């Protein structure tokens, strides 16, 4: 279908309405083929560089064959330059002549992940994979998934369109090799749309009422949200690290496209909240995240202390990256809510709600000198309320005598946290110019 | 015969403007995880995703848990159930 529709696009003068009707049917039933990143890459350039290069370099390329490439590839680690040479001549071929090589490349993508291969092989294989994607995506996606399963069912197209997260159940070595992560994200973005279409068709088929429709919608929303969630989990570093910068950038681009495609995903991923170690990354990586300043006011209203703690932390980085009147009109509300929760919260939760959100206040001060006296008032108030609570029950460090200056008690930890934050805000104000 | 329900605490503070109120939990939540998506907290997301997908490709709540004494109404269950067996 993809090949024929491209041919029809090319030839428009003859086919009067056939082109229009075909394109409507495609875009309405097969949305996992109308992904702009696929068709844009087709237009390439008008630079004729590829044409001129091919016309003068194909000649008689010593009759390269799928079996020839397979022979070299079975011993690629012993000889990598042979593989380099073969694929280098592969790149020149036209979008059609490449099909015979679909199995050879896709089937044997496992050992590419092995350490040592110069990333030129991977880049060239990615380019070839994109060329093949522009021609035959349906078969290619299934081939790639079943080739990248970890080291073993043979997933089918209909199987993947049901549970597309199957795409992410791949070799963990994939999450640290940029060129193949790109391909995995392409498949994921395709198959999420494909799943939408599949469910939409399935419900209409099985109708032989609304409850079902909004069940479909809820399922799709949760499905997109979960995909985003695992993607962010990928961005998180693994303990071994304690490449990743390229992987995070590619995930950032994909997330940006999803967010522009639909807002509700932005509103849902956040109401679920995600590990707050990632905020410093995403806030800058995804340029279309400023929208959060719309609903953070709604978010803070949620009863869950976890949700409120997340909201304030997010607002901290948003205020740094963007400094707008709306941002300040919400930053003020943040401090007011913190003051309110100070009054309304027992100590056991006061610790759990104030320790991981106080370092957020230095960010507000950095962003808004005007919103400063309120910050300092709240800081001193919380400081001395905690100090008063300290004396109520005997302590072993007794931070009171520290006035003239491990696993400790919660209140001592809270007081030390407030002291550190005040040191930090003083430093940022001194060096903030 | 009218019950009184505690309201969401409304705390406007003079230290999204002047009409804000941090919500207070209401016991009678009964969230519809299946009908709506903003429920399903992060931890159980995979479970509820798979369960919703199964439930669809094959109702609104997975657990009924009637707290009423109805658990001991074997009489009403019998009246629902037909039983024409007579000697």
């Amino acid at each position: 279908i993809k090949f024929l529709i491209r041919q029809a696009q090319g030839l428009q003068q003859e086919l009067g309405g056939l082109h229009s009707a075909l394109l409507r049917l495609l875009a309405t039933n097969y949305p996992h083929l109308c992904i702009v990143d696929d068709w844009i890459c087709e237009e390439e350039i008008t630079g004729t560089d590829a044409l001129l290069r091919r016309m003068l370099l194909t000649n008689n390329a010593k009759n390269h064959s799928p079996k020839q490439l397979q022979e070299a590839f079975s011993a690629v680690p012993v000889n990598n330059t042979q593989v380099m040479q073969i694929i280098e001549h592969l790149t020149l071929l036209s979008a059609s002549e490449l099909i015979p090589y679909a199995e050879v490349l896709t089937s044997n993508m496992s050992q590419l992940l092995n350490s040592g291969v110069p990333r030129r092989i991977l880049q060239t294989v990615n380019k070839l994979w994109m060329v093949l994607n522009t021609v035959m995506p349906r078969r290619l996606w299934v081939m790639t998934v079943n080739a990248l399963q970890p080291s073993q069912q043979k997933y089918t197209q209909n199987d993947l369109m049901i549970d597309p997260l199957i795409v992410l159940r791949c070799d963990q070595r994939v999450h640290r090799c940029p060129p193949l992560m790109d391909i995995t994200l392409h498949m994921l973005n395709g198959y999420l749309l494909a799943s939408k279409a599949y469910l939409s068709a399935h419900l209409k088929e099985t109708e032989q009422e609304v409850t079902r429709e909004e069940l479909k919608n809820a399922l799709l929303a949760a499905q997109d949200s979960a995909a985003v969630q695992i993607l962010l989990e990928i961005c998180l570093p693994t303990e071994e690290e304690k490449n990743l910068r390229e992987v995070q950038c590619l995930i950032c681009c994909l997330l940006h496209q999803m967010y522009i495609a639909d807002p509700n995903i932005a509103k849902l991923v956040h109401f679920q909240g995600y590990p707050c170690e990632l905020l410093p990354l995403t806030v800058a990586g995804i340029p279309s995240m400023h929208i959060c300043l719309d609903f953070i006011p709604e978010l803070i209203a949620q009863p869950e202390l976890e949700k409120q703690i997340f909201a304030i932390q997010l607002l901290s980085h948003l205020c740094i990256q963007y400094a707008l009147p709306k941002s300040l009109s919400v930053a003020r509300l943040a401090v007011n809510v913190m003051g309110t929760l100070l009054t309304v919260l027992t100590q056991a939760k006061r610790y759990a709600f104030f320790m991981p959100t106080l370092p957020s206040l230095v960010s507000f001060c950095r962003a808004f000198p005007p919103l400063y006296e309120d910050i300092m008032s709240l800081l001193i108030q919380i400081g001395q309320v905690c100090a008063s609570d300290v004396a109520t029950q005997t302590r072993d460090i007794d931070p009171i005598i520290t006035r003239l200056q491990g696993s400790m008690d919660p209140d001592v930890q809270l007081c030390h946290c407030i002291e550190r934050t005040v040191i930090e805000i003083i430093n940022m104000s001194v060096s903030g110019i | 015969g009218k019950k009184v329900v505690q309201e969401t605490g409304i705390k406007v503070r003079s230290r999204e403007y002047t009409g804000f109120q941090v919500a207070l939990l209401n016991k009678d939540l009964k969230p519809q995880t299946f009908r709506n998506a903003y429920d399903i907290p992060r931890r159980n997301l995979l479970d509820h995703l798979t369960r919703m997908r199964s439930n669809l490709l094959k109702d609104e709540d997975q657990v009924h848990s009637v707290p009423i004494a109805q658990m001991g109404n074997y009489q009403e269950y019998l009246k629902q159930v037909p039983s024409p067996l007579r000697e």
């Binding site: 809820a218 522009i260 807002p263 509700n264 932005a266 400023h290 719309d294 709604e298 | 709506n36 903003y38």
Partner: peptide, 22 residues
């Protein structure tokens, strides 16, 4: 507002979206 047009940009002159309790 305008998720793709950016907050600092020249302006051109010429079904449950909320939490169940909220």
């Amino acid at each position: 507002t305008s998720p793709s047009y950016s907050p600092t940009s020249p302006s051109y002159s010429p079904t449950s979206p909320s939490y169940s309790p909220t």
